[PDB]
Symmetry: C2
Subunit: 106 residues, 2 copies
Amino acid sequence: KPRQKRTATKAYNVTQAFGRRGPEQTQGNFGDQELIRQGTDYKHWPQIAQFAPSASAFFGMSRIGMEVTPSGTWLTYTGAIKLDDKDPNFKDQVILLNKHIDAYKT
Amino acid sequence: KPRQKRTATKAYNVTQAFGRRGPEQTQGNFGDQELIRQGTDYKHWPQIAQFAPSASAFFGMSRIGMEVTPSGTWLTYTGAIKLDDKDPNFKDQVILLNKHIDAYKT
C-alpha cells in the first residue's frame, strides 16, 4: 500500500499508482504508453528492472536527504547507475531506456 | 555482480559494496559506522528498508535521465519518498534516517 512499495500491473497502471507522468519534480517521467498501461507486464520489463536498485544499493549508492516541505516530510534521494560498456546487450540497453525517458512529451 | 543488485551484509559491507562514504556526487552519504560494517545485518535495517522503492516504484516515482561522460553511460535518478506523519513510529523514523544521513562527517 505504501507508494514506494507499489507495483504497476495491467490492472494497476503506473499512472494509477505513481500519478501522471509530468514535468514537475514531484512527478515521474520514465515510461512510454506501452509500459504505463501494462506496468510490470511490459514485454521488456526484465530488461528494464535489471537497473532498479536493491534495498541495500538504494541507500549505499544514492545521496539521501531529509526535506520538510509544505506537503510533509520527504526522504530525498539522487544518484547514478553505471551501465556495463562490455555487455553484449548494452547497445540495446541504451535504446530501450531512451525510449521511455520523457516519453510523455513525444 | 551489478552494483545496483548488490546486498551489503557483514561479510560484504557497505564500503566493500558501494564504496567509502564521501562528499562527491558519485559517492554515497548514507550510513553510520555500524550500518556500514553490518549492512543488511543491521539491527534497524527493516526500519530503513521500508523506505526503499520497489522495482516498479523506482522507475515510476523517480525522475530518470541519462548522461554520457568520459567514464561510461549513467542511468541517473532523482526523487523523494514521502513519510507518513500519521504513523505513530513516524518520529522514530525521522530520527533514525537523520542519524545515518551524512553520518561520516561526525
